[PDB]
Each structure stands twice: as C-alpha cells, then as structure tokens.
Design a binder for this molecule. Structure first.
Ligand code: HEM
Ligand SMILES: [Mg+2]
Length: 305
C-alpha cells in the first residue's frame, strides 16, 4: 500500500484548506478524491525537482460515513473537545483537509485553485491558511519549530497505520489546530522565561537539561513514553501565518500519527495537565480557534474510488 506524502521533505510554504461537504456534494467529492494525485502531478511536475509540491487529503469521521460504506479506520472519530480549567481545545467543523506544501506558495495556490474549482457548489470553505517558513525554521514565538520530529524509519513507524488496522494500512491521522498568539504578552517575558515555557534555548535550540526543564514546559508535556518504555512520537509541520494589520500572529499546528491516541494523549497533557503541571505554559500565549481530526488514507485507496 502506497501512503500519501505525509513524510514530505522540508517545505517553506503551505496552504491548509478545510471544507465541509454540502448536502448532495458527496458524488462530486468522490470524483475529485480519485483525481487529486493526477492534479498534484499536473501542477507540480513542471517545477520538479525543487518544487516539492504535495497534497495530503484527509477525511473527517462524519464525512467518511457520508462518502463510504463498509469498514472504517479503527481510530476515526470527531476531534475530542478538551475543557481544561483555564484552556479549551475547541472542535470546529471540517469534512475534508487539503494539506498542500511546496517550496513556493505559487504551486500551493495553483493546486488549491484546481481542487476548489472541481468542488465548487459541493463544499463550503471553513478555513484557509497560507503558511510561511519564518527565518531559520522558527515559529511566531521565535523558537525553532520541528527539531525533535522523527526522521526516516522512526517517522514511518510513528505515522503510518500498519498491521493493527490492516484494511487501512498506509493511512495516517492528522490533527489540525489553528493557534493565535498573544505576542504582546509573550514579548513581555525575558528570553530566559520564554525558554522555561518551551523547554529549549531560544537562540541555539539546545534542550534544557532535565534538572532545569520545567514540568509545565511544552517539551516536558509533549514528551510521552508508552507502557513498554518507547517514545510515542508524532510528525509535525507547524506553519506560521498572520496579518500585521489585524495583529494576527499564528501557528497552524498539524500533527500526524499512526493512531489519534498519541496526539490526543499529548493534547490532554497540554490542556488538562498532569500531577506536576496545571497545563502547558505555551497555552498562556496561544489560543486554539480551530480543532479537527482527519484520516489521510493510503494513496491507492483514493485512486480506486
Ligand atoms: C501552540 C502552538 C505550538 C507551538 C508554537 C509549538 C512549538 C513547539 C516548539 C518550539 C517545539 C520545540 C522544538 C521541536 O522539537 O519542534 C515543539 C516541540 C513539540 N511540540 Fe509543539 N507547539 C505547539 C503546539 C503543539 C501541539 C498542539 C502538540 C501536540 C498535540 C505539540 C507537540 C509537540 C511535540 C511532540 C514536540 C516535541 C517534543 C519533544 O519530544 O522533544 N505542539 N513545539
Ligand atoms: Mg496584542
């Protein structure tokens, strides 16, 4: 089974497009799903090898039951709202995700235009974010973002469904959340205080040693081990976005994993906390305004519709 391009090389541009399927739009969506790989080749090929254009298509739980009959991916459910004592992870509507990445925005935009042209009158846009790589892989908080992502075989094993759900092997689960940052509040902190929020040095990106890394730092709370002692990993490709006029400075979070259980465990630790941590300190400067969960099927599943 051939996975979608979940494990993309590093790209500096992205479009995240989240849509709902209007009543009666199911047939139009099915036809487009069977063509998206063709469209990705048509738009991207003339910019190879440096274009690196890819589209990962995800289908939400409710949408799956409208589009398909028979067996479902084992972990496919609607995003689970988290009502923490301070912070809330909201669930927002989303039937289809198109995670479009490239070395240039122009390739992303052209593929988004071709996809949305085919879906006109069948879908309603819910979210559209144009993301950009910010200096040396930094996010809007000024920290390097992606450092401890798994690579190679480790990444394949973390993100791709295998024999635990054999009918859907080569798929993945994507969790998206659009975050807005309170940059005025963040910039009121010293660099040393910001490093205690994230759990790494700001300029050099060296992890704080275990003796000084706070229990409520981002890195501490999103570090999770399984019962068998192994690290539970996700693959992230967070993208900055914003609008200076509106004072909107955001991180578009996207995390891929073999099972939503790994991503949801991290979210629970962030929003509801643990024994030693009320919540992830990153949320004191970051508000989630969307939250959706998608299954990204194997490429051959989409081709065969
Ligand atoms: C709120 C906006 C977010 C920002 C700005 C952000 C930023 C960062 C930064 C700067 C790092 C350290 C460098 C790195 O390894 O990437 C990091 C690590 C991480 N983040 Fe986030 N993050 C956010 C949300 C989330 C969410 C929602 C999750 C999970 C559901 C998550 C999971 C992780 C994980 C697993 C790591 C690696 C921890 C480790 O193993 O060392 N992040 N993030
Ligand atoms: Mg402000």
């Amino acid at each position: 089974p051939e996975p979608q391009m979940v494990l993309s090389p590093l790209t500096s541009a992205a479009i995240f497009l989240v849509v709902t399927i209007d009543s009666g739009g199911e047939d139009t969506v099915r036809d487009l799903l069977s063509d998206v790989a063709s469209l990705e080749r048509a738009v991207g090929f003339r910019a190879q090898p440096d274009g690196r254009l890819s589209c990962v298509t995800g289908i939400g739980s409710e949408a799956w039951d409208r589009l398909f009959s028979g067996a479902r991916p084992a972990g496919l459910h609607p995003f689970r709202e988290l009502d923490g004592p301070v912070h809330r992870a909201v669930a927002t509507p989303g039937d289809l995700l198109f995670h479009i990445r490239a070395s240039r925005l122009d390739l992303c935009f052209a593929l988004a235009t071709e996809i949305m042209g085919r879906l006109r009158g069948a879908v309603t846009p819910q979210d559209e974010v144009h993301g950009f790589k910010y200096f040396d892989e930094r996010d809007m908080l000024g920290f390097v973002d992606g450092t401890e992502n798994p690579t190679g075989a480790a990444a394949r094993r973390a993100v791709l469904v295998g024999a635990e759900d054999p009918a859907f092997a080569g798929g993945s689960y994507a969790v998206v959340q659009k975050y807005l940052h309170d940059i005025d509040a963040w910039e009121g902190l010293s660099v040393e205080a910001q490093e205690r929020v994230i759990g790494r040095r700001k300029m050099t990106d060296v992890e704080l040693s275990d003796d000084v890394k706070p229990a409520d730092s981002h890195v501490a709370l999103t570090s999770v081990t399984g019962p068998d002692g192994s690290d539970l990993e996700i693959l992230r490709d967070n993208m900055p976005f914003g609008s200076v006029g509106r004072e909107e400075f955001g991180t578009y979070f996207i995390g891929y994993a073999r099972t939503p259980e790994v991503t949801e465990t991290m979210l629970e630790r962030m929003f509801l906390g643990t024994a030693s941590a009320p919540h992830d300190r990153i949320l004191d400067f970051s508000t989630a305004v969307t939250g959706s969960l998608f299954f990204t099927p194997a490429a051959d599943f989409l081709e065969d519709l």
